[PDB]
Write a protein that binds this DNA or RNA. Structure first.
Ligand SMILES: [Mg+2]
Ligand SMILES: [Mg+2]
Ligand SMILES: [Mg+2]
Ligand SMILES: [Mg+2]
Ligand SMILES: [Mg+2]
Ligand SMILES: [Mg+2]
Ligand SMILES: [Mg+2]
Ligand SMILES: [Mg+2]
Ligand SMILES: [Mg+2]
Ligand SMILES: [Mg+2]
Ligand SMILES: [Mg+2]
Ligand SMILES: [Mg+2]
Ligand SMILES: [Mg+2]
Ligand SMILES: [Mg+2]
Ligand SMILES: [Mg+2]
Ligand SMILES: [Mg+2]
Ligand SMILES: [Mg+2]
Ligand SMILES: [Mg+2]
Ligand SMILES: [Mg+2]
Ligand SMILES: [Mg+2]
Ligand SMILES: [Mg+2]
Ligand SMILES: [Mg+2]
Ligand SMILES: [Mg+2]
Ligand SMILES: [Mg+2]
Ligand SMILES: [Mg+2]
Ligand SMILES: [Mg+2]
Ligand SMILES: [Mg+2]
Ligand SMILES: [Mg+2]
Ligand SMILES: [Mg+2]
Ligand SMILES: [Mg+2]
Ligand SMILES: [Mg+2]
Ligand SMILES: [Mg+2]
Ligand SMILES: [Mg+2]
Ligand SMILES: [Mg+2]
Ligand SMILES: [Mg+2]
Ligand SMILES: [Mg+2]
Ligand SMILES: [Mg+2]
Ligand SMILES: [Mg+2]
Ligand SMILES: [Mg+2]
Ligand SMILES: [Mg+2]
Ligand SMILES: [Mg+2]
Ligand SMILES: [Mg+2]
Ligand SMILES: [Mg+2]
Ligand SMILES: [Mg+2]
Ligand SMILES: [Mg+2]
Ligand SMILES: [Mg+2]
Lengths: 121, 51, 48, 129
RNA sequence: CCCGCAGAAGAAGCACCGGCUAACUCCGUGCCAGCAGCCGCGGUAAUACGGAGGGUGCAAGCGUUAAUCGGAAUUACUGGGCGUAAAGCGCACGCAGGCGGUUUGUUAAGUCAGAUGUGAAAUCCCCGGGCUCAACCUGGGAACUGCAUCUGAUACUGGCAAGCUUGAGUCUCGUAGAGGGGGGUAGAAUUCCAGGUGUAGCGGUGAAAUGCGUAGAGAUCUGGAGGAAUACCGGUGGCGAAGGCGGCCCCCUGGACGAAGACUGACGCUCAGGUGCGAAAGCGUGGGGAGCAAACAGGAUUAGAUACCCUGGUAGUCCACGCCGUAAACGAUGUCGACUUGGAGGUUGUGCCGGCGUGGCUUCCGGAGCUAACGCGUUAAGUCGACCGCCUGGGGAGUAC
RNA sequence: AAAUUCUAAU
């Protein structure tokens, strides 16, 4: 562009939006589980992933992923969620913090304990 | 090509439902299909209902 | 049903067997009896 | 239209040197004469001469050392669409001093190190190196 | 802060080991359970899932999540692009705006030099000092790239005054052309109407059938009516800003080019808004209707054929006026100016003695150079200058409001 | 001169 053309109309910068909008620039949020179920991933993976539908404290209604082997969650349980996207799951955009308010750590987990909230034996 | 997209039949006897009530669900097969140009193994499934 | 290995497995009771050729010939009485057994001990256990 | 005679002179010199011509001839002007004098004293051309009275013509003689042009790059800087003026303490250096830059200061058209010696700034004409 | 006392006596965890990225084997499960920042692992012989042994990296911390800059030259002022990857408005006129051939005088507005005042302290950087070192505290300096005023310089840009002819424009003679608007007229051919001769087929297709014909078709001959388009010339030939322009004659009219001579004296280039032109289809009113032919009907082909083929056929194609404003509106290449080896042609002027030069426009090949390549290559996509238009991953979408 | 199609793991 000509320097005159730039003086008349300067350069713009990409907005570069966020991909975890339900958190609202918060590291973690608290919510209530309205539904706990399972779902099937995209091509080519195949499993029965465990997800949950959660209503936050600011009114948002999102879907969260429950990692680890086995959970004690059910309807009407309060949990703490954080960012993180599961790729092959379409619509899942957050992760459930294990070891939080009403979710317990993975039973018999001796490696990477702090990521699943298990106390040192 | 081959069998039935859906078959519905009636089985009549003494003691039928008490032994066929556990076949209701999904049945998975892993094998080389007949409609296969190459030699690939394929996984497929069928659904069974007993009432 | 795995034809490459010739193995039939039942996930409800976790029972694997290597007699698929007999099973595909209407000899599945060797598959349904183990289930019924496990289906009956629960019925007695579900009396509370 | 012709809105830059100095850039035309620079382009004429560049196209003459790239094509292995023996000289370049163009219409004359005082500023072109000053730039040609600076170039001749700095050793980038052999000689220059002006002839005629009503429509003066300036011609420069190009020089080649090993069968290749002495002047490698020459580029106009302060073009009509955007002018560049610099202070004495921030006069540019070309090729870490191996090349030269032509600046018009209040004492005339001269090089950059000469203006540093004089302690003067001005408008930068071109980078030749 | 110092001295003494007893005892190694009270004090190490977190993440990772497929590549990016430093660090590997065994067992368990068998696209299940599960892992994942991006590629991607797991289907009964997994260095990628879970456990164990081993190793790697940080360490009173280690990992994960949220937010910012960097890498990202991925908004490119430093420092990007538009022939084919995203990207030149369909074309032109033109106000505001941006830019300005050459000489002299004057001004010092921009520009440059010096001086002065100001730019709080802390912070940042440098040379030192004090806490046993460090973090920390602190002395002095440097810096705060800025602003204003005074005095100087006149090379470049601007203002004022006077000029100059090379950019631009006017006048005299002539040339070529499907350039535009209006009117008149000529020939060939199709269709229709009337009449003569004449008798059993005509038409069409790969083959058929629909259709026409003994109520005399097709064929051939004579007379008439009306509409539309201009065979040969005709040619990567000519003209026009683009769209576009083709029989012959007349009337009004725009531009281009050439040879000489005279005249004005920078009057120029580009151009957001704005304005005008703009193929075909389509719309309104009033005419016209030969041929062709969307929609429609029938006959064939086919598994079906709302198509390709055959027989018919209405809007439309034509004229006057008024709208519409879109095209693969393409050279997928904005306008203007300067510079840089060659060859073979075409078309249109002029000078000199069939030959020797000099202008305008145009087609093909190709050198240097440029490009990712294909290719462009004096009519540049090579080297530069001025101004305008446009682009920032693929869909959603040139879509909704 | 006729002539449609080939899902999903190497
Ligand atoms: Mg390694
Ligand atoms: Mg891991
Ligand atoms: Mg194994
Ligand atoms: Mg593992
Ligand atoms: Mg492992
Ligand atoms: Mg940047
Ligand atoms: Mg980033
Ligand atoms: Mg730039
Ligand atoms: Mg780019
Ligand atoms: Mg394309
Ligand atoms: Mg494109
Ligand atoms: Mg164009
Ligand atoms: Mg114009
Ligand atoms: Mg001006
Ligand atoms: Mg001044
Ligand atoms: Mg100053
Ligand atoms: Mg300070
Ligand atoms: Mg002046
Ligand atoms: Mg002036
Ligand atoms: Mg004409
Ligand atoms: Mg004409
Ligand atoms: Mg007749
Ligand atoms: Mg032309
Ligand atoms: Mg044009
Ligand atoms: Mg004329
Ligand atoms: Mg005069
Ligand atoms: Mg406009
Ligand atoms: Mg029309
Ligand atoms: Mg009409
Ligand atoms: Mg009408
Ligand atoms: Mg008709
Ligand atoms: Mg039909
Ligand atoms: Mg017809
Ligand atoms: Mg008719
Ligand atoms: Mg009209
Ligand atoms: Mg368009
Ligand atoms: Mg066209
Ligand atoms: Mg285009
Ligand atoms: Mg040009
Ligand atoms: Mg070429
Ligand atoms: Mg160019
Ligand atoms: Mg290119
Ligand atoms: Mg996008
Ligand atoms: Mg629209
Ligand atoms: Mg089908
Ligand atoms: Mg296929």
């Amino acid at each position: 562009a000509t320097v005159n053309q730039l003086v008349r109309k300067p350069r713009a910068r990409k907005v570069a939006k966020s991909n975890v909008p339900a958190l609202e620039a918060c590291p973690q949020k608290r919510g209530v589980c309205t539904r706990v179920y399972t779902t099937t991933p995209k091509k080519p993976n195949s499993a029965l992933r465990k997800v949950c539908r959660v209503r936050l404290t600011n009114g948002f209604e999102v879907t969260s992923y429950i990692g680890g082997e086995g959970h004690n969650l059910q309807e009407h349980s309060v949990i703490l969620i954080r960012g993180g996207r599961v790729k092959d799951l379409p619509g899942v955009r957050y992760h459930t913090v294990r070891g939080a308010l009403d979710c317990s750590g993975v039973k018999d987990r001796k490696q990477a304990r702090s990521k699943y909230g298990v106390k040192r034996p | 090509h081959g069998g039935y997209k859906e078959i519905i039949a009636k089985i009549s006897g003494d003691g039928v439902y008490g032994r066929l009530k556990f076949e209701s669900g999904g049945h998975r097969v892993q094998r080389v299909p007949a409609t296969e140009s190459q030699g690939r193994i394929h996984t497929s499934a069928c659904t069974v209902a007993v009432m | 049903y795995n034809f490459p290995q010739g193995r039939v497995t039942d996930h409800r009771i976790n029972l694997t067997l290597y007699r698929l050729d007999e099973v595909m010939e209407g000899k599945l009485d060797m598959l349904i009896e183990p289930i019924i057994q496990e289906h009956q001990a629960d019925q007695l256990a579900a009396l509370s | 239209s012709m809105q830059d005679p100095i850039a035309d002179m620079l382009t004429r010199i560049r196209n003459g040197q790239a094509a292995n011509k023996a000289a370049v001839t163009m219409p004359s002007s005082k500023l072109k004469v000053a730039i040609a004098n600076v170039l001749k004293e700095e050793g980038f051309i052999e000689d220059f001469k002006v002839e005629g009275d009503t429509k003066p013509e300036l011609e420069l003689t190009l020089k080649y050392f090993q069968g290749k042009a002495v002047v490698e790059s020459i580029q106009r800087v302060s073009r009509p669409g955007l002018r560049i003026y610099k202070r004495k303490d921030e006069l540019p250096k070309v090729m870490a001093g191996l090349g030269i830059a032509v600046v018009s200061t209040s004492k005339g058209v001269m090089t950059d190190r000469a203006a540093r010696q004089a302690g003067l700034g001005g408008e930068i004409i071109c980078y030749v190196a």
